[PDB]
């Protein structure tokens, strides 16, 4: 059918011109809960509203504080790769941090002690690369699909350096001196950025491993997410990756979270900084609790990116008959949230029932253990 | 079909949960131009894609500088009250203009003299209400449904005052003496604001003027923009109303624009100020040029908001079998635009020539009259 | 006796030791109206509360952004002259504005085309002087107390330049040439600034007016406030000063308000711009509606600095047996304000009704004339 | 007698109307040393000036940056709680610290791992609560007024979450899904927060303590701070409490000081951050050396905020018969100061001279222990 | 010989390795008056010390608030065009103006109503182009270097918009459906800017005028500076050009000013707004007094940029045996100065003798008449 905005005897039929079918995405922003009260920031915005950048070999389309403004601390790109492509070597002001939706890719990233590290990721594979360090991409047989985030809103052209393009800006004279050799040995070195590339698929991984008289890397830049033992609950599981246990990964924290059919994210909050969201696929709706008696509710589906400004309460509830997965991640050192359920578990009794005007028929089914994901008894 | 993100050998088909109904909308920002280049702010949010706030007689969404940050001087509201609605007496920091897309509403405004008007708004007109002076609007037979629009983009909560709102955070003793009447008299009084209430029909508007010992206003409230005359060229029509013709509206001035299907509003730029646009009906796209080899395509339809920074470059196309209408908008005393038709032919030929790169073949389909929609030969 | 936080029910003793002298001048601030809610900022201050700057003549202290954060846009200065004493020729980056709250003064000004303007100012008289030039104050027989403010918020040392320390820090040689004189004629300049100095009285102000070839200024510096026909009513008066009859004073609009004993400023808000209060004498309180349900109310007496930002909701009370007298200060070229019984007297009455709930018995009591100040029947 | 601002032949009598009580606490204010030069910020400010929130069962009043504007990164609440009476589970975006001044109080918290924290503080003892993470306090049988410093000086409405205002904010069906309950199970909940609540005196401590499966929390949220030896000097005594003995308190550093009658914090400054004072009880005159050439002296007593910008010289002398006690609080993980007597002390004598063009009879009284209160000699 | 930072017993010699030709162009700054003091911030900074950018035809160097932070609001450009040189056809959000140092030029504009001018400029000519309005310059028979000042200090490449680049960047087939062409009839447009660009010398300016259906612009985009009368006075001559007499100069107030050996700019201030400075030829030095005992002498010489924020004393005196010529520059609608000799003329003179500690000898020699440059006696 065709949705209205209208709840009870509040609201109305739209009128004038509209546009349904994202209406239809957002029942509960056209038909919001009585109980979202006041101004609240968008805390949403879909990749599929951002120009995408087309290259021979793959794409790559942002989301950042100038689509949504509210992340001012942490932004995001989208990028694709066919097979035996190349996002050319380069390096950000921005520490980077990536999830492997589709696909399997190689990276390289050498340290400031000259050490280097090659390795493949597949999906569910993360890697971080710290600020200023340089490093490439090439997507192997299947092309790669994955999300970069980086720990900086205002990411733009200007966050990325590129090999290409740093040599076709550098004196022919400086290069040839910088490196032993005639400007003619080097004429042919290309005149603008390459970016993403196409080339031949890389061979096996041994084979490109390269020995250095610096050492190994004292820590891998990358994580077998899904590898490890997951917080399993009732209808959900969310696997946990900072710096506790994936070492390089000092600025972002993050937790891949499954919220089956019929269950919830439960109402939580982050006592250490602000989420970002990235919804890989399902369809959610979460509100956002900000303070003071204001409240909104937003809807999100795959491709969507979400935000949680620090502190504010939250849930996040699969409204759809697909599994929910999304992404949340945090500009910080370490994973943390304070939970509902669990706060209250651990308070005395008659002092929660005072706070909430409720009997021991309430408090008797709080748990003092984590349940960060829940199933609709 | 199913859209992909491919222009000839350039990008890639999309491998991860997607927004499909988003890339139908967005042909050209999945696959844009050849053409665009570089970081460009984006300039196009939906109007569904906000909380809408429903209440007993109609709702209210709002797209401000916390949805679309480059509109940082000019945010947004889409207002609908059902037949008899009220939207409560009150007053903005910011100034307020508005099109009437649907229906009709009698307004209420008295100035700082002591001077009223009242007067009813029908489809095609507009009124502006100088800032902090307060004012009404109460739906008529058919409802109503407007764009309003103020002059800035921060417009929040905190912009407006409350005529219920005043009185129910004031003293009820301050109240009484400031009327002269008992606080027994006053006990009925509201304990909070109302915003839109359903109430009945007014009467004439001849019966509802009120007069008194101030004078009736200088300058009217209203204007009716489609009653004038507008400048009518090849593929469609274009109302302008700004400080000028409609005197009460120093900070807003606005243009209506038709684009018939095949036709654009041609390539110009504005040398006064931003522009901000909304969607009526119809689809469009638009490449904002950005200088310095920067330019990015967005698409548009019913619904959406649009921006052109101050002096970007910039054409808007009809991409669609209906009719395309637009506002333009812009925070200024006056509209003002320059041709690039009407510019390069009023220089020297052979001067155009030296630029362009080509011959007396081109410069003699230049013109000196503006034709500020043209229908493609 | 000693006041206590208590509100019927609400509240308690004060427990910690405490300033009970402060809380005696602050009964609505210790005991607000149940009406008050939310944050709002601090809108008073007191010079009291405020380092004074003591010379040989007189004395000088102030009231800024660093004082009283909120008003960003206006400072002022409360300063006394003994007999014959002068303040400095100088001139400032903020234009002056000034109220002879004591005794009387002559002051100089000379403007961009060397034309000269030497006047004598008494109690209730005002002077302005446009930003950048030069003038002087000295006090005549009586001494002199006056209140000055500048259209700038930020005003501090670095706002002001001095005659004596320009040329303190000027080369020798360069003053020498500048004048057409040797350095040693010029040996005796004082090495710092003078800022206040004693000095004889002047003599009549018919022998001081200095002839020039440049013609008269335009338009006089000073104006007589007392002298004009005050908007007179039932329980006070005000007497009106902006650029429309004050003509040089462009950037300030100002009001003198006589409230009596159980009278009060009616309820009213400025559409134009913030308003920056001085209390002269008396005891008032004052409520702020900041809209969305914030409100704060504050007391007010002699020497203390107020505020109320643009649009806000406000009244200011007499709560004493001595009359209240405060200046109302606007940076701009006029005073507006909406009268909250003026506004509803000129809307329907039955739109008024069914915005408040009450009957025909209100709206009867409504007047079309606006008046400022009003006695409690 | 009637204090006037003349020191010598300077400064001159009042003539306006003005606060005498006020110049009567301000006597180094309307009268500063002559030592005294050049715009200084205010650094003081009084609770006695703050409107107070009245509740059942308390209330609470706050100095925050709009109120003092050189605290930018530091505002408190003065809170209040009848026997009994409960600030409602909550939690802030600041950390928080706190000073018991009267009474005891059982606080809750229960930090990011599930682990609960309940205990009962009494006059002396300190409470901090890292930023984020849910606590409450209920006053005991004496009720309690507290000292309550938050490391934002942007404290505001914003900053506080509450348990029922969550709640009523979160549609019941979440709530219902959350819990495992039936919505009519939860229809009780409060419709808005509670903020203070009158409720019945708790038991014992012990019966209180809530056991869990995830240990007791490492470091204690609670510290007594009298019950330490204090820096015990000539005139007073200094208890300190920073990260490296109160663990918990990482972001804030305090020391309660008591000068006796005649004796003075002696001069000194910090060399790691700002100063944030709260003045007990006493009264007291402080000079902050603000830095070439720049000096203001400012009065304190019972009630008062003051600051010392950082690295500021100052000092804070009794100028009155009781003792004078007072709160230094420093946004950091350390106390630290650096004594002006001390620093001296520890350089060669001769090279002192030579700065102070003094001789060994200075010199002597030099000590290199140093003495953070001393006594008149 | 070679300079030391010697003054009388103060300084020493440098004895690092040195920049030995630019102490010796800044003998006031490695040796300043004594009366010299405090922070002030630089105003002075050389084109010399700017990357010149080389294009065929001419080049083109600026400084800007990157260069020199100070000058906020306004920026220049060095240009320089050999003979029929182009500067292609383009537009700024800032409006420009200009004067020709060398050489003459064309330029062309049209405005917001289609109308164009197109006009012959030559040495001591200006040009003003308000924002947004495209012009161009091509270089006549001589070539051409002129001096461009920008209204906004903050320009940059992201400040021009140029035809080429706009065609460059729009897709083909909107360029081809905007002018009613196929696409193979615009293949040969541009791929990148031009900027410069060499190109035959134009004929005579009587065949480049186009005719138009819109009618002449109302007032002229040139003006012959040095046609004017100019204020003569002892030791040099001022020619103004503002709004009031180059009427469409409404940002941009201008005086050319030239000072003879052995004269100077009077000591004065500007009332109105922040001097922007250029040196055409000849040596200067210039001491900026910047109030409470600031005050900072600077060097200038042919190339510099110098600067005086709003309302700071001020003389530029010639230290050289060339004539000193140099630009003074307003963003304002008029130019105003006030000048202490002819401010203290105009005061009592036992009023200015009481201030200054000197007699009738030196008040004598005041003037009534603002002498803009005087010649030492
Ligand atoms: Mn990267
Ligand atoms: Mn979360
Ligand atoms: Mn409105
Ligand atoms: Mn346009
Ligand atoms: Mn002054
Ligand atoms: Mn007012
Ligand atoms: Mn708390
Ligand atoms: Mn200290
Ligand atoms: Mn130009
Ligand atoms: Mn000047």
Known sequence: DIPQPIRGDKGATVKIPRNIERDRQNPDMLVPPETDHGTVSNMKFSFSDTHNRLEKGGYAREVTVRELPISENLASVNMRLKPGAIAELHWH???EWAYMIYGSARVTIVDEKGRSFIDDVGEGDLWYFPSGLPHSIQALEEGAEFLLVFDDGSFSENSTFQLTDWLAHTPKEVIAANFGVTKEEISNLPGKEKYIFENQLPGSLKDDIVEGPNGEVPYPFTYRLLEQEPIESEGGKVYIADSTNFKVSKTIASALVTVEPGAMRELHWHPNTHEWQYYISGKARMTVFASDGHARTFNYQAGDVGYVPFAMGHYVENIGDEPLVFLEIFK??????????????????????????????????????????????
């Open 332 to 377: 910080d050192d370490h994973y943390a949230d304070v939970s509902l359920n669990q706060w209250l578990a651990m308070l005395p009794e008659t002092f929660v029932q005072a706070h909430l005007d409720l009997g021991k028929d309430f408090t008797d089914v709080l748990s003092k253990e984590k349940h960060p994901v829940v199933k609709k008894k």
């Open 93 to 95: 002001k921005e520490a």
